[PDB]
Each structure stands twice: as structure tokens, then as C-alpha cells.
Amino acid sequence: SGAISGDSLISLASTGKRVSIKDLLDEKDFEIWAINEQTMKLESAKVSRVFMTGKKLVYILKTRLGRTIKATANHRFLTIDGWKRLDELSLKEHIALPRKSDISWDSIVSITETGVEEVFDLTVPGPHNFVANDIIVHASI
């Protein structure tokens, strides 16, 4: 149920390349990087499908390291105490970023509403999350 800006760069596990999620709309069955929540280790995982969900108000989330992403109020990020909607995060939270133990829990330094844009998501069977703009984000539903 979330969605992120089409500008967001998706990390491709088999290569180390990044291509915007907008540019991946007509693509499927490629691997992305997901965190396995039970083990807290990153693992390659297949993307079932990519899709746009329409135009939605988006918000810039920025971490102390400088990682940033634009996303809907309801898109979820991985917090020390679980998945939380962007609109539920506060500056006291830390969120999961891929490090290369497998992850860094970085402080949020900014959350600001920016504007409406075309927004996208993807489905990832099993772990249900992926790395975009070098930040761990939840996938479809």
C-alpha cells in the first residue's frame, strides 16, 4: 500500500547497478536487495512486477548519512521497533539502511512534504521489501 517517487533508484542485486523504479515499470523477474527480518541479513530477492499507482503527495525523508527518498505518507520504513509509515516517523527514530552487521540504523534528520507526483511500487514475494536510494523500504500491500 505505500509508493515512492519514480525517481527512486532501485538497487539491482545481480549487478550493483541502479535504475529508477519508473525506468523499471516494464520489467520483471530481476533481483533486488531485501532484508530478511527474521535473520536481519540482506538477501537477493526476485521482483514479481513493477507498477505506477497514480499521482500522490510525496514527502522527502532524509537520514543523517544523507540518504534520502521521496515517498507517500503511508509508505513503510524499517524501524528498530518494526515497520512504520513515513507519517508516523519522528526524529527520534532510526531506520534500516543496507550497510555494505548487514545494516546500519541511521537517524532521521528530515521529513518534509514536497509535492504530488506519479508514484510507484513493486511486489516482492517472501521478504516484501527492497532497497531504493540505498534505504530499506517495504514492498507492495
Place this chain on the structure above:
Amino acid sequence: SGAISGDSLISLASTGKRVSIKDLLDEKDFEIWAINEQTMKLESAKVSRVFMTGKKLVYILKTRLGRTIKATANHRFLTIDGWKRLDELSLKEHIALPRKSDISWDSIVSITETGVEEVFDLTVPGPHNFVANDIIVHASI
């Protein structure tokens, strides 16, 4: 225990004038606007003293109306369910702004760390809060 940037403009109840809290450091016993939490009505209240608390990292909080203020991570604002530290606020919260029923509960649209600056507070016996940059904020201790 909070504190806000010296740039913050303090609403003077007897006149309707605004002067930065930095500019009020050597001033006392003037009235400011405070909310009476039991009644939720604004009332004039005396400022006992104004003081700088040193240099501290500050954060810009902005509301949907466009009201904005720079304040420490621990400075409190009035939420629909009580006083909350800036670092505990999320975009789903609304905070109290003086309206002229007596107050408007406006959505937060931005919270972003900005930099270190000299920071100030003031003491207000009884209601313990005041209006700065047209936003209700908690006073000393």
C-alpha cells in the same frame, strides 16, 4: 527544558507587537499570550524572565498554514493529545496555533534539523507556555 532560536518572534499581549526573544533577554514582567490547558482559551500572562541557555542544535518545524519555528529536539509543542517534544512529533500530528475556537490545530508539514545556534527560553508562572512565531510553545522546565 526546551529552548528556541533567538530569532523567534514573541507575541506581546498588551500591544500586538512582536520582538525576537533574543531582543527580550534583558526584559521582564511583560505579558505574553498563553493557552490555559484546562479551558483551552488564550489568556494574557506575565513573563517572569528571559534567558539564553547556550548553543544547541536546532530544528525547523513547519505547519500547513506555513507557520514555522526553529527549536531544540526537546522543546515541547501542544498536540491534540498533549505536550510532545519536537523529536517525538510526526507528520500525522496537529499542533496548537493561536487562532485570532481559541486555537487552530494545524498539521505538521515539515521537521528538519538545521544547525547549532544560541537558544533561548522564558519562564511563565501558571500556564507555562507562550506564543512564538504564532505557534503555542512550552515554557521553562
